[PDB]
Design a protein around this ligand. Sequence first.
Ligand SMILES: [Ca+2]
Ligand SMILES: [Ca+2]
Length: 537
Amino acid sequence: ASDANINLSSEKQLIKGFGGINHPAWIGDLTAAQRETAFGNGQNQLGFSILRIYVDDNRNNWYREVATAKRAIEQGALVFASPWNPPSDMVETFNRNGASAKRLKYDKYAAYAQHLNDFVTFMKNNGVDLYAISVQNEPDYAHDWTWWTPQEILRFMKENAGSIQGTRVMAPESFQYLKNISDPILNDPQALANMDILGAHTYGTQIKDFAYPLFKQKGAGKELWMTEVYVPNSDNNSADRWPEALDVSYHMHNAMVEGDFQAYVWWYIRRQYGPMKEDGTISKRGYNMAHFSKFVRPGYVRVDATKNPDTNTYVSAYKGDNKVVIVAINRGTSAASQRFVLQNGNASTVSSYVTDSSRNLASLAPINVSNGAFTAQLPAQSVTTFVANLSGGNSGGGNVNTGTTYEAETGTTLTDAVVETLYPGYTGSGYVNFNAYTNSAIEWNAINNMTTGTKNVKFRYALESGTRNLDIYVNGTKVLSNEPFTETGSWSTWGEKTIQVAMNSGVNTLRIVTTGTEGPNMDNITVTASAKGELNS
Ligand SMILES: [Ca+2]
Ligand SMILES: [Ca+2]
């Protein structure tokens, strides 16, 4: 079309995540700081949610994966492992089309499954519960590792898989998503029962081969992961090249919309042609990935959208956590105007971030929505990710109780009051002391709430002997006049005092000011949204 119609109620695949491989044996481990850059979200981090690791044929090297894998699990990431060869007493040589090749010996299948089981439990004993393990990396491009034919894989999936306990089983990790090596698994119910995820690589894979009708036909309840690629090349010092790097986002678009893949996993995380360079910083290829990985979190679903609404423009869209996300790619040489139409879901405003030849996730002005529709300018050779709060929704639990603390001493505006550090036990760099008996004040101007509603505002403060009353203002309106602050009993005894006030979903202000009687020493403020159904008395 021309309009990019985003059908929010027409659900597609459940997104599992985005990531890459750590390979200590071949390129060395990530350093501590690169782990954060890789698997944290928020500022200047890739937001990766999936970590792939090596299953070494030598079990005396298994220890090497633990440090990064633990950390990644602490950052909420999934972990899965891939073998290249079985142990070398399990392998025999043979001639395959003129070349000496390796395969798993036919009487050693049960033992190879025991070697995989042992990896899973070795990691479990060191605090890493694998989401999945794979039968073999690229069994159909194994010139340098161990080959399995479609029937060899099939035999193992029927007879030996699902004696794999402690995790999910993944197969066949074909190099080019070749259907011939997964078809046998899908067409056998007993082999199919033992497969939990169909993994595929996509090296050389044509757009038209991303579809897999048989998987649609017979694959309900199985996951579909794209477990290794790098694109469009492994050229030296290429990670920052533009517009070349834009092919990363196009490929991911293709994976998401043409292949309905739930996970997209890169080859080496840290590499000169990868998403993180050798200096530890995010490359232009890294940011292309970031456009999906940072905003399309695990648990989001893809939703139908006009995929190609103008010759060089590509659109995909996702829904989760009461948000719609849209990824729009203009591959062409001229900037384009693109209208987006939201259907079966609604928003008023839209945030957007854009990567191009001169910018990396640059924040653009909040543009807004009139009757489900909004237009936006997509620069030449750019990828733009849009984000918008959808109407009428919620999912809660505890829940917030997210708890957000704002210190009284920094990020604040003082009138006749000063920061001090005499009495200990304060959070932050100190506390604030009021100087005057009447109208010294502290004003927070940066209180940022997800939603409108009633907020509980807990003051942490110290007060030796008196009661000391404060007037309180929210957004310029006085909500309480001469609110008492009872003694804590000492300038070092920090107490708490909660009030209820109403605040918008944007940036708010809170102002406390003396009225006579001075004030207490003020440590910080904690602002929590009060749940619907809880306003108790
Ligand atoms: Ca004081
Ligand atoms: Ca403080």
